[PDB]
Amino acid sequence: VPDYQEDIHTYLREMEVKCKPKVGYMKRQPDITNSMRAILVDWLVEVGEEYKLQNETLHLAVNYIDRFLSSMSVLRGKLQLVGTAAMLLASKFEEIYPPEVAEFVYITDDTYSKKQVLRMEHLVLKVLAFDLAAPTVNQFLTQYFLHLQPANCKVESLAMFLGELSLIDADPYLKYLPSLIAGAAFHLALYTVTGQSWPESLAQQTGYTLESLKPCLVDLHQTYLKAPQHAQQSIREKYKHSKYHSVSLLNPPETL
Amino acid sequence: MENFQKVEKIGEGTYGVVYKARNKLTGEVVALKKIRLDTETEGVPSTAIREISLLKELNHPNIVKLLDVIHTENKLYLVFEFLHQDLKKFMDASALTGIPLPLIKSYLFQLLQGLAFCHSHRVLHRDLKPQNLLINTEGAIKLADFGLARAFGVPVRTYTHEVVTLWYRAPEILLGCKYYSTAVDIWSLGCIFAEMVTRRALFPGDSEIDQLFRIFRTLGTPDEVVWPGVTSMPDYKPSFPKWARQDFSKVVPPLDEDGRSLLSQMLHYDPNKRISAKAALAHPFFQDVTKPVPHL
Ligand SMILES: Nc1ncnc2c1ncn2[C@@H]1O[C@H](COP(=O)(O)OP(=O)(O)O)[C@@H](O)[C@H]1O
Ligand SMILES: [Mg+2]
Question: Where on the chain is N6-acetyllysine found, per UniProt (chain B)?
């Protein structure tokens, strides 16, 4: 435990409140819905796999997208341009090796031109005022993982999977802060794999009792049960792989 | 744009130029960093995207202030507060005289406060060298040039291998560790501390292997006792000559016992045992610290 570690957690807990998108913004969007958003995010999951991008890059792109759509009206035909420039920007921030723009143009099958993607990058930068370093569910998970001695990798792959599922459905999950989503996903992953529960050490560090995770936990549990039915499958396909311990193939618990 | 008169060109990079400039309306003197988007068919360079997003969150007396960002189609300007000069120019001007001990201690104390702030905010600097450090006329020094900086996770993943200017580069990077962290910044400051004291670069390597050997010759060749895991590192070779650690009375003659103690903790081989910025600030070396005015 480095001595700046507690400071970083406190800082991120403050930043997640400042970088939070408006919870009800999709109502105010005339032409696009929670369902088009799910199709976009799911597609971004596949783009991430095709280019072997980090999970963090995916979580950042979604944060950028939701904040951009919080202040800007977008027609359905331009939604994917917003998502593509969001992914390009998260790639430049997060990745050692960001894909070049011509590759992002290729992955949309020439739906947009290079000039459009670059111009959308400019607009997204302007609208977010270059504040690109957002806390994500992913960053909070990796901190929570340190409370497992010894590390349980299966619990980790499962928590990551549950956290990534939350990105798909704006309703309910925009209602919860990344830190709380990460808390429920961690406890749910841990209970599923080891049958154990949210550690007292995390309850003290985060301030969340198991009780306070309950609302988000009920939601997350349902999402988990219904995952094979959900119209968007890219995350399940991704977490079937052995590098993830095929955790998407694990049966969820029936009750909590 | 039209409200800045360019006074002089104070810096250059392949990215663009840095000018000392004056706001024509308010009279405010600024440093103006121009970044070429036009020769970028890739759009805004990730180096600029990181520099801006990270600087905007870092607000501290010992970190240079980003005043404004002007983003047009063909160009990107960063506007910073103007400071008298970088620590390299100061060191060259002081090469004959020497920098007074109370001033070296003040500057190290301040650099450590800026760095501890960066780290508490989950930013790695990764280019700490004298030309990226800025001093004003009132005795302040500030971290600058966040172009190589990165937000890091807890715990860290593998980040970019090519980071830190060779002379200031930590051994865990030279030996090719996949994981590195805040300790690389502490190592660079250690080198800068020694450089202020002796008026000479501590490890002036002309290549990666040369850099490594210069470090070994001074601190001794690391073994599994002082640095567990070192012989297992990707670029480690068992054929490396084994040199013995020199006495610090040889390395930094002017330094007192407290100074030598701090420097050696900043140069510890094992990144895990290397002193943190927070802990460095609490070291006895700083108990008398004052803020003297430099001579320019
Ligand atoms: N705020 C400033 N005040 C005075 N000089 C500066 C300032 N910022 C940069 N400079 C000068 O210009 C330099 C180059 O700019 P820097 O920010 O380091 O970016 P780069 O090294 O990528 O060009 C520094 O070495 C410094 O001497
Ligand atoms: Mg520089």
Answer: 6
